[PDB]
Amino acid sequence: SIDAPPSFKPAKKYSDVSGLLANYTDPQSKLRFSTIEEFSYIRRLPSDVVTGYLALRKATSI
Amino acid sequence: GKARAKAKTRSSRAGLQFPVGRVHRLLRKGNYSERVGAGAPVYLAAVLEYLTAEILELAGNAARDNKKTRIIPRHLQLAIRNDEELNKLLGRVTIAQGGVLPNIQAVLLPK
Amino acid sequence: KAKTRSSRAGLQFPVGRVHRLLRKGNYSERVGAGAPVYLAAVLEYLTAEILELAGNAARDNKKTRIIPRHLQLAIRNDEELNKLLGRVTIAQGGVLPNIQAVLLPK
Amino acid sequence: VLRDNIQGITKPAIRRLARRGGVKRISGLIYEETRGVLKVFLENVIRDAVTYTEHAKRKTVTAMDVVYALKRQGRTLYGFGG
Amino acid sequence: DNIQGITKPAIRRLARRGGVKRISGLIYEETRGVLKVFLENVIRDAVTYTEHAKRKTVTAMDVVYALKRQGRTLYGFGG
Amino acid sequence: RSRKESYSIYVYKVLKQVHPDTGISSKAMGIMNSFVNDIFERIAGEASRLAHYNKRSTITSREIQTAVRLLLPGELAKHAVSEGTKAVTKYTS
Amino acid sequence: KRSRKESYSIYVYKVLKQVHPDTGISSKAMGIMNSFVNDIFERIAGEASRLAHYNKRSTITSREIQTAVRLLLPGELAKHAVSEGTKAVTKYTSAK
Amino acid sequence: PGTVALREIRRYQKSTELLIRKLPFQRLVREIAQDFKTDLRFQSSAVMALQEACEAYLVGLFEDTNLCAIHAKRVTIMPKDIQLARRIRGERA
Amino acid sequence: KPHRYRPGTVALREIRRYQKSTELLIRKLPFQRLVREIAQDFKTDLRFQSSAVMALQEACEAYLVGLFEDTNLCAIHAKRVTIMPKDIQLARRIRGERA
Amino acid sequence: ETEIIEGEVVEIQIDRSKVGKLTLKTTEMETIYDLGTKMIESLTKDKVQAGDVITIDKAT
């Protein structure tokens, strides 16, 4: 009984490649970006960095 | 020695439905290897769940269009042969009393 | 004096090696005594049958060394060996010479 | 009459099987040839089915034997056991 | 683009081993498709076997294992 | 008596998740039994052979996952891989 | 020092010298024969494994490989292999 | 004419029964099995499975035969097509 | 003026010449480049053993020779000597690949 | 100032509160969206199918 309780406040969403306020997502990769150049960059990226970003902030993908 | 009464099954702990214990027993008794891992039966049960769910969903969809409330071998046959993935997975199998898909070649059709 | 089981049974292929492979191959937990003997006998028979035909083919080719071509000829010409080895391909062995009747000139 | 039972596979039966196969016209020389083919198939299954019956020291051929015989020939059958 | 590396005389030679006298001129473009597809399956297995052993080099036994799983057995390469 | 055994009461139990008002005939039950144990034997044998090829003693989650990848033709392979990974992840925790 | 490799090179060569005293053999043929023996042995062994499961057994018996080898081989070849293996086992059991 | 045959074609491709009479098939199977060993007994399910497998084989054979016949700009199937189908499939030569 | 051979005899000459020898037909370098590019399309940064690529080459050649033999049977069945793609499609379908 | 969501809808999925999910697609990006209970009614009232170019006022 010394660990902090789970937060009841919803957690914001941030761009996985620029650290800015995200407002969209991506069904093909399940990541989040902020602008058009972010979308082009994330599409140009291979699967290795995508799965690394997904595993960083752990998600339904291992 | 005291133990928990009516302990939970491994299938329920895994969220699956096929018997993980029976799969593990079959793996151990089948002499595929001298030692069988821990998570292998769970994974195999999950794959079997997926396959059974897919084939049964398709069979039920096929049977619904035939105004029938019960699955028969014909509905399974129609379900498998109409999906390319399941057809190539089950290329060399024979379904008993399942008939053949109805298809006519363009040349043999009148006019 | 230690005598090998192959010599005791009058074979050439190793009974001990076959028994070890059967035991370590996960085919069953218990391996009989005569199983490696009988398996080695069958393997020796098959090897002799293939080899004698390969040597006959090599002699017909007027050469004293067996190459994959002679093995291919021996397998394909014999009906039973071809039936046994239907789905196998011999490396750099080619195919038998064959011309269809209708393709001959006039 | 002393007649071979391969002729027991009647011509209408072969026509029915062909029509299930999707063929419009049938030449007259198929009828004797198909039976021959039907022989060869039964010569490659029953032979196996008997051998298993040998290995179990049994005298009655069971459905499991024929299912295993068909299984090894890449012609697996569903719904008759196994 | 490297499928064009399978030149036309090579296809002619492969046909000639089979025992055919005349070759259509449009056969090659379709035949290069078959070489394109039949080769896209063994590699699917060949890399995958390689990826099981934590190694990233395609050894001569992986292709043998793939061809064995598909139903085409070859001898002389450690089979 | 005899524990003939079967998955009859399992695949049927799966049916309610996809079609809650659909029945199964006895012959269809036998068909599904044969299908499931055939796929079981296929996957188990492939995993065995692969483990023997890699000179290992234990058939693990990754070996059977690779067997599924080899055996399942297309999108079924990746979807079953995801399903199995989710199942094992929930089993561990 | 690295590991030791395993093959059937000497035994097939000995059989060849026993059947054709003056006929040699190449390296590629050596590899092909090795693969052939491996494949045939694996076929007979793996096919024999299933009969034990089918008949609820635990041991591989000589009278069981006898049934296994007459399914993989055609008529005359299987008959001759069975006869020679029976002779081999009969000669082996007389000395033990 | 040429349309009553297509009536059958469409009828049989829907119904799923045994197109060969049971008694002659049983006699044929018994006579074929007599040579291997005398005085045999047969499970009924074994005979039914035999007949089902044989009918499936024949249906597939006739499908391939029809493809062969269509290839040569014909409508009638002749043994020249069955031999080709068997040869190229792999049961002979 | 120069002696010209009939169209067709050179065909049988090449048939007899190639059906006796057992060399590799496809040039080694294009085949290696093709398999390398295919592998990189699947998984980049891969290493290949020379024996592996030559075994792929021999398997492909055996497959093509069998396919062309079946194609020849199909073409002769249609009262022809020239092979057209429909013969290959028919063979591939009856064998059970394509369809 | 106003917030406007304009684009082509690809797929809509509403379960049985209710959970909703839809994927919008412009010519330069795609985006998945989870719907609240109000948006469920706002989308069921005006039947929206695949391949429809829609404009939504966020504040309303």
UniProtKB/Swiss-Prot annotation, chain C:
GO molecular function list: DNA binding; protein heterodimerization activity; structural constituent of chromatin
Residues annotated with N6-(2-hydroxyisobutyryl)lysine modification: K24, K62, K63, K83, K106
Modified residues (N6-glutaryllysine): K83, K106
UniProt KW keywords: Acetylation, Chromosome, Citrullination, DNA-binding, Hydroxylation, Isopeptide bond, Methylation, Nucleosome core, Nucleus, Phosphoprotein, Ubl conjugation
Positions of modified residues (N6-crotonyllysine): K24, K106
Record note on modification: It is involved in the initiation of both imprinted and random X inactivation. Ubiquitinated H2A is enriched in inactive X chromosome chromatin. Ubiquitination of H2A functions downstream of methylation of 'Lys-27' of histone H3 (H3K27me). H2AK119Ub by RNF2/RING2 can also be induced by ultraviolet and may be involved in DNA repair.
Site of covalent link Glycyl lysine isopeptide (Lys-Gly) (interchain with G-Cter in ubiquitin): K1, K3
Gene Ontology annotations of biological process type: chromatin organization; heterochromatin formation; negative regulation of cell population proliferation; protein localization to CENP-A containing chromatin
Superkingdom field: Eukaryota
Residue numbers of N6-(beta-hydroxybutyryl)lysine PTMs: K1, K24, K83, K106
Modified residues (N6-succinyllysine): K83
Family recorded in the similarity comment: Belongs to the histone H2A family.
Protein name: Histone H2A type 1-B/E
UniProt organism field: Homo sapiens (Human)
Residue span relative to the full protein: 14 to 119 of 130
UniProtKB/Swiss-Prot annotation, chain D:
The protein's role, per its UniProt record: Core component of nucleosome. Nucleosomes wrap and compact DNA into chromatin, limiting DNA accessibility to the cellular machineries which require DNA as a template. Histones thereby play a central role in transcription regulation, DNA repair, DNA replication and chromosomal stability. DNA accessibility is regulated via a complex set of post-translational modifications of histones, also called histone code, and nucleosome remodeling.
GO molecular function (one): structural constituent of chromatin
Positions carrying Phosphoserine: S27
Name of the coding gene: H4C1
Location of N6-propionyllysine modifications: K11, K24, K57, K59, K71
One GO CC annotation: extracellular region
Site of covalent link Glycyl lysine isopeptide (Lys-Gly) (interchain with G-Cter in UFM1): K11
Effect of K11R: Abolished ufmylation
N6-(beta-hydroxybutyryl)lysine: residues bearing it: K11, K57, K71
Residue positions where Phosphothreonine is found in the record: T60
Protein name: Histone H4
UniProtKB/Swiss-Prot annotation, chain G:
Residues bearing PTM N6-methyllysine: K17, K79
Residues where N6-lactoyllysine is found: K14, K56, K79, K87, K91
PolyADP-ribosyl glutamic acid PTM sites in chain numbering: E6
Modified residues (N6,N6-dimethyllysine): K28
Residue numbers of N6-(beta-hydroxybutyryl)lysine PTMs: K5, K56, K87, K91
Modified sites of kind Phosphoserine: S7
Modified residues (N6-methylated lysine): K87
PTM remark: Monoubiquitination at Lys-5 (H2BK34Ub) by the MSL1/MSL2 dimer is required for histone H3 'Lys-4' (H3K4me) and 'Lys-79' (H3K79me) methylation and transcription activation at specific gene loci, such as HOXA9 and MEIS1 loci. Similarly, monoubiquitination at Lys-91 (H2BK120Ub) by the RNF20/40 complex gives a specific tag for epigenetic transcriptional activation and is also prerequisite for histone H3 'Lys-4' and 'Lys-79' methylation. It also functions cooperatively with the FACT dimer to stimulate elongation by RNA polymerase II.
Disulfide bonds: none
Residues with N6-glutaryllysine modification: K5, K14, K17, K79, K87, K91
Record-listed N6-acetyllysine modification sites: K56
Record PTM Omega-N-methylarginine, positions in chain: R57, R63
Residues glycosylated per entry: S83
N6-succinyllysine carried by residues: K5, K87, K91
Residue numbers carrying N6-crotonyllysine: K5
GO molecular function terms listed in the Swiss-Prot or TrEMBL record: DNA binding; lipopolysaccharide binding; protein heterodimerization activity; structural constituent of chromatin
Similarity-based family: Belongs to the histone H2B family.
Protein name per UniProt: Histone H2B type 1-J
Organism: Homo sapiens
Organism phylogeny: Eukaryota, Metazoa, Chordata, Craniata, Vertebrata
Residue numbers of the full-length protein present here: 31 to 126 of 126
UniProtKB/Swiss-Prot annotation, chain H:
Superkingdom, taxonomy of origin: Eukaryota
Protein name (record): Histone H3.1
Residue positions, PTM N6-acetyllysine: K14, K37, K73, K80
Post-translational modification: Acetylation is generally linked to gene activation. Acetylation at Lys-80 (H3K122ac) by EP300/p300 plays a central role in chromatin structure: localizes at the surface of the histone octamer and stimulates transcription, possibly by promoting nucleosome instability.
Covered range of the whole protein: 44 to 136 of 136
Chain positions with N6-glutaryllysine modification: K14, K37, K73, K80
Any GO MF annotation of the entry: cadherin binding
Signal sequence bounds: none
Keywords of this entry: Acetylation, ADP-ribosylation, Chromosome, Citrullination, Disease variant, DNA-binding, Hydroxylation, Lipoprotein, Methylation, Nucleosome core, Nucleus, Phosphoprotein, Ubl conjugation
Phosphoprotein recorded as keyword: yes
Modified residues (N6-(beta-hydroxybutyryl)lysine): K14, K37, K80
GO biological process, one term: telomere organization
Annotated positions of the N6-(2-hydroxyisobutyryl)lysine modification: K14, K22, K37, K80
Family named by the database record: Belongs to the histone H3 family.
